[PDB]
């Protein structure tokens, strides 16, 4: 899935729009009604660790 | 390719109103900022109107703030712009233009921002008149 | 506002002939500023999107340059398909300002 979202970056004044493609099994819908509005399965029980 | 065009400009009466479309394709719609601009017949070319990618923080010129708004719906990729109050003088071929890049980048408020843009495609812009 | 002098206002031309579009700016805009051209009835086109650079699509022919407020295009009319008005508008400011415009034909 080619996925977009927000990200912060150094200058904490300023923000920036990326993208990256990530597998279905790493997603998981938010609403199911919109179909867009995915959010990282992880996301509501801890915040992972990138190796 | 890029495909552009717009439609529902006609004839339309002093002080009425009216409502611009343009409508996408072939491109991401919901990640380029679109503009409208107008060509008067004879004089050069103007810009009238601007909006993001996301829909927010229109902007207009002082020739027509107050009358004229601006809409988009990324679900349809469509662009529209609606006409209140308008006078003899808002005469021309309404082009419905894209920006060059994408929004994708650094921003400060709106996505969008802090980049340098100009109307790279343009669209088969519609005549609007209005006369007694 | 910030409002562009484009000249000259109108020429005349040949084939071969090197006509030279410049416009002034009342304000500095560094380099932001692309030049276009638009044949009756059809919409305009980008040819220069920066004070120096290129579009893509069009031949190498075309060229032009400046800064601050000074620029100018550079012709060589090696063909006979560029005869139509040649727009000069500046970014990186609220109202994107247009030029006046210039037509350049045979004589």
């Known amino acids: 899935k080619n996925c977009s979202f927000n990200m912060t970056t150094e200058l904490r004044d300023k923000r920036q729009k990326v993208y990256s493609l990530f597998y279905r099994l790493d997603i998981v819908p938010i609403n199911e009604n919109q179909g867009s509005e995915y959010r990282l399965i992880n996301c509501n029980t801890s915040a992972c660790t990138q190796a | 390719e890029v495909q552009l065009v717009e439609s529902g400009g006609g004839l339309a009466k002093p002080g009425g109103s009216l409502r611009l479309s343009c409508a996408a394709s072939?491109?991401?719609?919901?990640?380029?900022?679109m503009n409208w601009v107008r060509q008067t017949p004879g004089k050069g070319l103007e810009w009238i109107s601007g909006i993001n990618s996301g829909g927010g923080s229109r902007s207009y010129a002082d020739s027509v703030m107050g009358r004229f708004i601006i809409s988009r719906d990324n679900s349809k990729n469509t662009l529209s712009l609606q006409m209140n109050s308008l006078r003899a003088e808002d005469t021309a071929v309404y082009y419905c233009?894209?920006?060059?890049?994408?929004?994708?980048?650094?921003?400060?408020?709106?996505?969008?921002?802090?980049?340098?843009?100009?109307?790279?495609?343009w669209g088969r812009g519609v005549l609007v008149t209005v006369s007694s | 506002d910030i409002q562009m002098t484009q000249s000259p206002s109108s020429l005349s031309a040949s084939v071969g002939d090197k006509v030279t579009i410049t416009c002034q700016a009342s304000q500095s805009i560094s380099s932001w500023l692309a030049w276009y051209q638009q044949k009756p009835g059809k919409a305009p086109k980008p040819l220069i999107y920066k004070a120096s650079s290129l579009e893509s699509g069009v031949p190498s022919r075309f060229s032009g340059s400046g800064s601050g407020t000074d620029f100018t295009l550079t012709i060589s009319s090696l063909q006979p398909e560029d005869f139509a008005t040649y727009y000069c508008?500046?970014?990186?400011?609220?109202?994107?300002?247009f030029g006046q415009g210039t037509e350049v034909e045979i004589k």
């Open positions: 072939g491109f991401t719609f919901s990640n380029y900022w």
């Open positions: 508008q500046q970014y990186n400011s609220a109202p994107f300002s």
């Open positions: 233009a894209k920006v060059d890049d994408d929004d994708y980048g650094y921003f400060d408020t709106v996505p969008g921002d802090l980049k340098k843009y100009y109307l790279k495609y």
